[PDB]
Design a protein around this ligand. Structure first.
Ligand SMILES: NS(=O)(=O)c1ccc(-c2cn(-c3cccc4ccccc34)nn2)s1
Ligand code: NA
Ligand SMILES: [Zn+2]
Length: 257
């Protein structure tokens, strides 16, 4: 099966998932000089006041913090989007070293990590349906640099010891994802895909310009997770990012000048 190793990593994925070589793959490099300001874009609307977190799961390639998406509770709207998108989960991608780990890059700069807040378009009724549609998902991507600690991340960091290995989960109620956002909601947007198999071309990407800062100790703790299951040889969960893919016939739009 697929993963992030020499023998099953991103260069291999196309054998099982040929859309790996498709026309709207993610992530991409964001060339800031070529992205055009689009004054027709709206401010984003991030409405997380009623978000209801449930659980945190090590799924063997990241950890997902899962939300109750059975009603409109935590929704993303505006920006480039038509309609209402419901938060289902967030996760991260990160490196073995502070100088790598993001999936998107900015003028070829790699950040230490990247947060993905995953939302599905309510007009399609459920996530499973939405992922089959070109406008099914909206993923809010936020870069992480290493510097000062992010206080709102610490509850995440503290639970990781209890989900060390693939298949483990833990209660994760009453977590407020507002505490992971930067000050500014300035963003880039473009049409793309899931960054993990099955690589479905269903995502409107919204990538915030302002990174959040986390401490070296917070990211060190991410790197103590395991890709393996319990009782199996230990494989540290690091460098779980896909590299930048060809832009092809796409424009990246800026919400700001
Ligand atoms: N990294 S990402 O934000 O692009 C992302 C957000 C959501 C993803 C995802 C992958 N999924 C799947 C996993 C395994 C099998 C699946 C089969 C069909 C559809 C999605 C599948 N479901 N959501 S990947
Ligand atoms: Na419900
Ligand atoms: Zn992701």
């Amino acid at each position: 099966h697929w993963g992030y190793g020499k023998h099953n990593g991103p260069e291999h994925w196309h054998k099982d998932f040929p859309i790996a070589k498709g026309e709207r793959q993610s992530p991409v490099d964001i060339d800031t000089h070529t992205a055009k300001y689009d004054p027709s874009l709206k401010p984003l609307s991030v409405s997380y006041d009623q978000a209801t977190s449930l659980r945190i799961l090590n799924n063997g390639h990241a950890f997902n913090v899962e939300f109750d998406d059975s009603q409109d509770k935590a929704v993303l709207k505006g920006g480039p989007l038509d309609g209402t998108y419901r938060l289902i989960q967030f996760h991260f991608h990160w490196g073995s070293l502070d100088g790598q780990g993001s999936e998107h890059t900015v003028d070829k700069k790699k950040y230490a990590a990247e947060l993905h807040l995953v939302h599905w378009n309510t007009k399609y009724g459920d996530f499973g349906k939405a992922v089959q549609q070109p406008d099914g998902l909206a993923v809010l991507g936020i870069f992480l640099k290493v510097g000062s600690a992010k206080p709102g991340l610490q509850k995440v960091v503290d639970v990781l010891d209890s989900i060390k290995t693939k298949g483990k989960s833990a209660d994760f109620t009453n977590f407020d994802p507002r505490g992971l956002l930067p000050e500014s909601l300035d963003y880039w947007t473009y049409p793309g895909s899931l960054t993990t198999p099955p690589l479905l071309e269903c995502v409107t990407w919204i990538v915030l310009k302002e990174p959040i800062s986390v401490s070296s100790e917070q990211v060190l703790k991410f790197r103590k997770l395991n890709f393996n299951g319990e009782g199996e040889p230990e494989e540290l969960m690091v460098d779980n990012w896909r590299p930048a893919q060809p832009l092809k016939n796409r424009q990246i739009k800026a919400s700001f000048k």
